[PDB]
């Protein structure tokens, strides 16, 4: 459909230079994030449909949950080990479904039950690389002015309006969502 500012998206008031072409913001604590990415799979539909070589990012936010910032480091570990797809469902589950993730040791146990070697996790968790990823996330949440999640910003300049995409079903919504992004990408 026609894309116009204020309808399917809004302009960032202070854009971010040298940002990835797509930046996703989420929290493992957020029921809406679970709903958006694990059930409806809107970010995954989007990731599948963008042009080849599109620079993508997915950042965790500190500001939800008692272990927000510990969970942001967990997500950095997941990125560093490249096991996002394996642990992401378990981390959502452990936070929201079973509430079995009570402490940082529980985060560690979660990675290990998702097949990550304890020794790799221990090497990674306070590594320079994981430290850099944590900084990367935290700074992104500031520079993109992210106050709520799920959120997606394109070209460091356009903020998606999730309540501005219309669909007769969630399945269409994700396709519809993916449709809007690619239009903002060619822009």
């Amino acid at each position: 459909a026609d894309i116009s500012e204020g309808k399917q998206y809004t302009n960032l008031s202070k854009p971010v230079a040298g940002a990835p072409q797509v930046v996703e913001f989420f929290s493992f604590y957020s029921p809406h994030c679970y709903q958006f990415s694990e059930v409806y799979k809107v970010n995954s539909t989007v990731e599948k449909n963008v042009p080849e070589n599109t620079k993508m990012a997915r950042y965790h936010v500190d500001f939800l949950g008692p272990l927000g910032k510990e969970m942001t480091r967990a997500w950095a570990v997941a990125i560093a080990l490249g096991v996002e797809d394996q642990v992401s469902p378990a981390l959502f589950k452990g936070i929201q479904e079973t509430q079995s993730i009570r402490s940082v040791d529980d985060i560690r146990t979660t990675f290990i039950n998702a097949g990550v070697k304890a020794e790799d996790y221990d090497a990674a968790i306070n590594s320079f690389v994981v430290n850099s990823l944590v900084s990367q996330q935290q700074n992104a949440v500031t520079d993109f002015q992210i106050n709520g999640v799920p959120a997606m910003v394109i070209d460091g300049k356009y903020k998606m309006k999730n309540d501005g995409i219309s669909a007769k079903s969630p399945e269409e919504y994700a396709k519809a969502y993916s449709d809007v992004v690619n239009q903002l990408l060619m822009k």
Partner: peptide, 7 residues
Amino acid sequence: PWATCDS
């Protein structure tokens, strides 16, 4: 439910 987000 895309209407609202968690802040």
